[PDB]
């Protein structure tokens, strides 16, 4: 009964870490979807046609 | 049955099943922040 009591004492603190960490990830994952839509409205404005042609004589790399 | 230490362990097996339910969400929502952070 000593081994099972020590499992029980640990899970009183543990359910608090899991609750606080699911709320952090679900609000962060709502903000990541809004970043990629906002920056894409400004990429699409610059990608506007028409645009000159070239070739690459060299990549310095 | 008779023992009152079986009633103590049943409260923490409902928190342990919740820890299995939470693991499937947390590891799935964490992998979606890693993909979108390379795009960002």
Swiss-Prot record, chain A:
What protein family is recorded? Belongs to the AAA ATPase family.
Listed name of the protein: 26S proteasome regulatory subunit 6A
Give the gene that encodes this protein. Answer: RPT5
What the protein does comes down to: The 26S proteasome is involved in the ATP-dependent degradation of ubiquitinated proteins. The regulatory (or ATPase) complex confers ATP dependency and substrate specificity to the 26S complex.
Regarding how it is modified after translation, the entry says:
N-acetylated by NAT1.
Residue ranges the record marks as coiled coil: none
Protein's cellular compartments: Cytoplasm; Nucleus
Swiss-Prot record, chain B:
Superkingdom to which the source organism belongs: Eukaryota
Output the PTM entry.
N-acetylated by NAT1.
Task: Give the family from UniProt.
Answer: Belongs to the AAA ATPase family.
| Function in brief | The 26S proteasome is involved in the ATP-dependent degradation of ubiquitinated proteins. The regulatory (or ATPase) complex confers ATP dependency and substrate specificity to the 26S complex.
Question: What is the designated name of this protein?
Answer: 26S proteasome subunit RPT4
